[PDB]
Ligand binder design. Structure first.
Ligand code: FAD
Ligand code: FAD
Lengths: 482, 480, 482, 482
């Protein structure tokens, strides 16, 4: 037997683990990661099986964005049989993975017209282009919702067959399915990947042990690039992944009710958004904030909890105000510096990566897992994932001008989403005075690379030393690839 | 001899029609250039038929009849304007200021009014086979709202436009004089009648003017003038002052929209609209408060609310624009919610009043109706329920009005817009129901005032409530 | 038996347990209660040693209020030697009970003038009458605070020798001191007090056991009256105690700093308030909401968490916005139906109660513990606590008119404290329409008893069946005592 | 000729006209100006006799500011006898000039701490230094006011003998007193001052006439510099005066009541402020906005009317909300480009100026009139007016750094005064991004001159062509004086 080590116990690590263990009787597969799931994105997720719900005008204006969207639409088709195959290893008492079949997208005025109006139109267009079943519906026909009238939706979009899963029941089902197929769970973290003669030898663990392997799959979420970056040359050949720190909450509803569908807005300032995912047992999930952090953070800020709760109680259901808080959850969306995932092989024989999936790795997991396992078996996996190979020059999916327009719009959107109340001249004054500093920052960081808006705002408000370290990083990447 | 009492749109419109149709008779029109409490000069004005539609109005038979008359009036306006402009020159300016209207739906209001009323307007347009289109908000020209106050739906109504009310008044006066009418700039103090017939009018300079016909179109003063005649105090429904505040603004860049911009009718028959004017001016309107006594000056509250709504919901550029005039006028507000149009039990005594928000729009139809009746005709088919000598109409159940007055009260909050703890609205709804139910039960066993008047009565002095209880009891005695 | 059983493991149970064990070395004292401390007030407390800080105009306008205040002033004097005696049983690593020596009371406009202006004046007058060391200080001289300018204080009052304790370190010190003095901890709950021939026999526990005793001291917080009410006649002779559900939070500050003093407002709508209590290790405590509930609740509502966080970030320090949330805490202030504590003996020989202390049982604990132990030893304990004996007709400390004025003012204060933004006619309209329903409720409940504002609002918005049950309760109490 | 022509019929022109006519009975004094008083500051004034009420920390931090304040304190002493001398020419039935004897300054939180807190402390210090009678009073003792509780004052300062006049009754009394003393009113405007051989010959009027004179006193408000600048060399020797456009209103109060004192805040963003001046007959005056405009404007903007009304109804009396609006008034405060008035003689014999008095020309009028008449008679007038001579290099009363700090604080104050509601990170973000653009503008305008904050904000948001014209102006002034 030829040993495979999967580093990471989120949706991506476990999904690849399950696929390898089921497909490869010739391999012993060991999966690393602790039950604490420190900084874990997956346990903090609702989660929405978001393909069309995730559409933004800005994403679909780039070739790379359209390619990512096509993969999300393909992933949706795999979910019914994937769920069936995971539930089959359990019993009724393990609970149901699927919590909703459909999604309603709501349009209210608690946000920027330049994001919410543009994104609602882009979602409609993407659905029509895909010939996907959907209907614009009367807001009056949306069941369950009880918004503040001043925060109410005036348009609503029903998307058929775009639903949600319980992320906790999914994780439990993946672990159980992994064990059933002969996989071994080793509850320790990788400290170091060992390689020599251009080949992986295995992994040093944080209990001081060494585990030998012919294949190492890195699916360590936001830690994935930092782990691989220690190997020779790879610090400037694997795009950096940061922590997209997200806050969500589990609430026991006042009357034990919940909506029959996912309820969501389109993506909002700096890839945040508002949604409610149904759960069993009189619980609802509400999400979810997003802030790119240059270092990991495992606790919610006061600001994040207040913003999430204020949005949900005003825009979705005022009944949530009197509902009991059961849990505040925090996890790190793996946020790639060039805005696209890191999926496939490396220049190191037997070294694979599955990371940088940001807001929709959980949704894409069955497709991504099958792609990487096909590559490991000498196949070509899924068409169109070649552009997202982990060992690459940074992608430039947008012009600097497009990103500078976007970062100012997203900054203004943090105001409109609050929502603020300002003198009417103040917004245009702030727009005018935001342009110059962001243009200056972009010019200073690099002659060739521009970070997307989500990362550019984090860099703008970081320490001088952190900005200078990123200037050096971008210059070493340019040197490596040009 | 014919005497028209009142120099608003209704008095002058009937004056012009009489003078043009009866060249053998002397027609004299009373009223002063000051136009004290005058509704017409304070109007934009919108030729609002479909724009005026509410779910609540169209749920009553009387409301559907009023709406049918508004739709009929629209058809008369192009030829009416042509006939008034024909008596003038290019230099008098144009009566028509816009051909079309855009209705905007934003969330700066109550869902129970704005969502219901937008759906009712759409249905009314489709039922009437009126040309209209739901349009993308992005395609509405000129507007620059606060994003948190922006519309998410917009409705283009073709051939529903606006007039300059000042140029209309000047054109009516000029057309009246051209047709042989006489303007006598004094007020009527008293209508003289004996042996069941009008003799004429005593004026406030002490003179007596004889007449075979007296047409009362004195706006909110109309019923008080006729109520002095024997028996008529409890046979002519009372008319109150629907005090409205509007403003003329010189825009920062001299621009204006090509269409009327408006919301549907809001709390207590207020609303937000912009009517285009010539010369880099726009009209913004308009507040509404039923007052048991007349008021000729704007409150601070009314000016701030009108300006706040226009700058946030229509165009932030209006914030830096110059205020040219704050206008105040009294919408004639009938106690039973419907106009007073036609003849009386007194031979030669006619009334044209109680038109509230849309007398100006209905004026050519109403003028032609009353002139047809004066000539022995039957005028316009659907006006019979709105005869001025009547028992008070009960167009809605007490329950419907109690639901409406609580919704309108809550709408004053959502329209501000307020920011409150989330439990407060349901708490206020619960504690508003009892007092309004108690007031309604106390006022009368049979009559219920509509929401606009019920809120004014709720917050009036005990003595004013008791006087209204006596009024309602004397009306019941008279008609039952 | 000369055995003593203390029922409850909060500050009051443990404080009386320690005093009994130290003063009666020949007797076995057993203390009941579980480490979970379900609904526990003490673990959720900051806690402030609040005497002058707790002063309201409304409390000091009643004879009973002035008597309660005199006891709080007396309790303050006991704290230095009490803390010394508790720390003496531990070592350096157990940490310090005292976290601050002084308090600053802040006056801002994020509240009702009828509460905050009246209460600030009452605190000043109480300090001057007691000849207590204090100073009105310039707001600019208050260290650490960084309020939103629109939420800033314009007056500030320094109170010397009014400080705070770490409630967690206090509980650990009381348990350790109890063991050191020969006390036994039995981690089970009392289900039933056994009595016959007018005398306590002991306690049935929830593991089915029977523990014999000559003395039973009930300090079970908000459960105290429900436990004793099962004994013959006592349902209408021991005033009911409800749950004053309070939400607080532990925050790790952005820079590890904290204030050197307690920072607080005066008591606000329905005995809520805003305060920050210093803690060791770069943590601060923020508190604290209050809602009287007719049934217990062990979880924070969304509303409570948002209100607490919004007040602290605007009125105390905007830096708390970016600070990490470590814990949301929930506990039940024991809320007596007649507004005064239940301290002393009963008509049942050997049955004692220490409860109904609402906002300041922790502060009064050393005085209350010494009072009850003196009574148990045949003394008269502390002068002025005989009015607060647990077996009594309901106190009527205020006229019905005073309470109706108070409940409308407190209702309006929930608006001003938010703070709301309303059309200027709405407040007077709401005041006018609130008076009638509260007058009607008060008249319907009883001809003789009026619940204080905090309880009256809970009864106003309770189910018809709960109102009717309270009407019957008040009628059975009147029958028993008249 | 020994004939005197006064150009201007505001408080300054009429005050100097009265003093000349009374002191020189042997000479013909003619006063020009029309009853419309186009752009007139005086008729739009309340007016407050503001000396201590006008104190700001920023003004008193400069030597020129302390000199201006000393003149305001000296002017206050003249008012009782000045009023007596004007009322003596009339009867009871002419009405009373004085409408209040005293002023209450209110401190609320509807503003920037960096202006309102600093200015309240500066007012207190200035009063103590001048030995002026005053008292800090309980807010509860301020009669009449009925603020929104969230907008209420927490501190109040009673200033004795700092009152108000009815500006309309003052103008009528000055005209009557002028005629009584032999003055002639000629209701036309001056178009041109004629001078040759370094001496005034007289004035061309806008009806084409020529009026000869040995003395011409220019008190034409904001038109005063434009009139004199036409004479040879004077275009860069007389500092420019702009229009400080101010909006005020007359309101008939709901019940005919008014306060017994002036009610005011200290000066606020860009020399705006909130005040109520009592009037006879159930009327109150409310003021007053301020905006420096590079061209005159005779109509109120929507923004100005809403801001004035919102502040008065929330911060002074909610009863004003239901009160009737009688008149919106607009006048131009003469706003000198270097921040100080233009008072005294010129290089042209017999040519005098009284202008650039901004917020307190009306208050200073009796002192300024006496100063100019003393100079015309060969005296030295009032001590300390020498720096404010009209023919001068632009004053630099503050460092560029002081003005840049001030303009950012005033910009932020437009937010806090609204008052806005924003996410807590936004204010520091806006402060950071406002500094650079104002620093850049200041550096670009001139190497030596810096406009005060009120003018700098108007220049920042003016057209490029208007900025360039001001750069040229500053360079021509530097050339003339260096
Ligand atoms: C703010 C506002 C906005 C409006 N907007 C619109 C709009 O968009 N569309 C629309 O269709 N309509 C609008 N209206 C007007 C509405 O249609 C009215 O119902 C209509 O204008 C009433 O006309 P009237 O001639 O009956 O009354 P008025 O216009 O009030 O004319 C009555 C006249 O009679 C005079 N008078 C009083 N007593 C006497 C007496 N004793 N003798 C002689 N004369 C006397 C008065 O001084 C007055 O000039 C608006 C009104 C207001 C106040
Ligand atoms: C948010 C908040 C903030 C506060 N802040 C302050 C402050 O700043 N200053 C101050 O002085 N005080 C403060 N307090 C506390 C206040 O003084 C309380 O009145 C006091 O803590 C009550 O103590 P207790 O021991 O009576 O009750 P608790 O602390 O409730 O203890 C009772 C214990 O008995 C247990 N129990 C219940 N039933 C049984 C049973 N059948 N058998 C055995 N055990 C049982 C419970 O689980 C619980 O642990 C605060 C409280 C809250 C909720």
């Amino acid at each position: 037997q030829t040993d495979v080590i999967v580093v990471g116990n989120g949706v991506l690590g476990l999904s690849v683990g399950v696929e390898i263990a089921r497909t490869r009787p010739d391999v012993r597969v060991t999966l690393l990661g602790k039950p604490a799931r420190q900084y874990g994105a997956t346990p903090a997720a609702g989660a929405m099986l978001g393909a069309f719900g995730e559409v933004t005008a800005h994403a679909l204006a780039s070739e790379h964005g359209r390619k990512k969207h096509a993969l999300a639409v393909q992933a949706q088709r795999l979910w019914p049989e994937w769920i069936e195959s995971l539930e089959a290893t359990g019993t009724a008492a393990d609970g149901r993975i699927k919590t909703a079949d459909d999604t309603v997208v709501l349009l209210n005025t608690v946000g920027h017209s330049a994001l919410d109006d543009a994104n609602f139109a882009a979602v409609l267009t993407a659905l029509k282009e895909a010939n996907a079943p959907h209907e614009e519906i009367a807001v009056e026909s949306v069941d369950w919702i009880d918004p503040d009238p001043n925060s109410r939706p005036l348009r609503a979009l029903h998307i058929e067959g775009e639903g949600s899963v319980d992320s906790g029941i999914l994780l439990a089902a993946l672990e159980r399915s992994f064990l059933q197929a002969g996989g071994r769970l080793h509850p320790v973290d990788a400290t170091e990947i060992r390689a020599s003669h251009g080949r992986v030898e295995g992994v040093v663990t944080d209990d001081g042990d060494f585990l030998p392997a012919g294949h190492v799959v890195v699916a360590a979420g936001a830690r994935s690039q930092r782990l691989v970056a220690a190997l020779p040359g790879l610090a400037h050949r694997i795009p950096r992944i940061y922590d997209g720190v997200g806050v969500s909450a589990l609430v026991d509803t006042w009357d034990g009710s919940g909506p029959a569908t996912v309820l969501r807005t389109s993506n909002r300032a700096f890839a945040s958004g508002l949604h409610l995912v149904p759960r069993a047992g009189g619980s609802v999930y509400i999400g979810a904030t997003n802030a790119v952090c240059l270092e990991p953070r495992g606790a919610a800020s006061i600001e994040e909890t207040v913003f999430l709760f204020n949005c949900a109680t005003h825009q979705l259901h005022r009944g949530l105000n009197g509902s009991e808080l059961r849990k505040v959850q925090v996890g790190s969306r793996p946020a790639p510096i060039d805005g696209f995932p890191l999926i496939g092989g490396t220049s190191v024989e037997g070294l694979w990566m599955l990371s940088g999936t940001y807001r929709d790795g959980l949704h894409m997991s069955p497709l991504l897992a099958r792609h990487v396992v096909s590559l490991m078996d000498g196949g070509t996996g899924v068409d169109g994932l070649r552009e997202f190979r982990p060992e690459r020059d940074l992608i430039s999916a947008w012009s600097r001008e497009e990103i500078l327009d976007d970062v100012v719009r997203h900054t203004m959107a943090t105001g409109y989403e609050f929502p603020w109340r300002l003198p009417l001249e103040w917004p245009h004054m702030m727009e005018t005075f935001l342009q110059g500093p962001f243009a200056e920052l972009a010019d200073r960081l690099s002659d060739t690379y521009t970070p997307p808006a989500d990362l550019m705002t984090a860099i703008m408000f970081s320490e001088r030393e952190q900005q200078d370290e990123l200037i050096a990083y971008y210059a070493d990447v340019h040197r490596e690839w040009h």
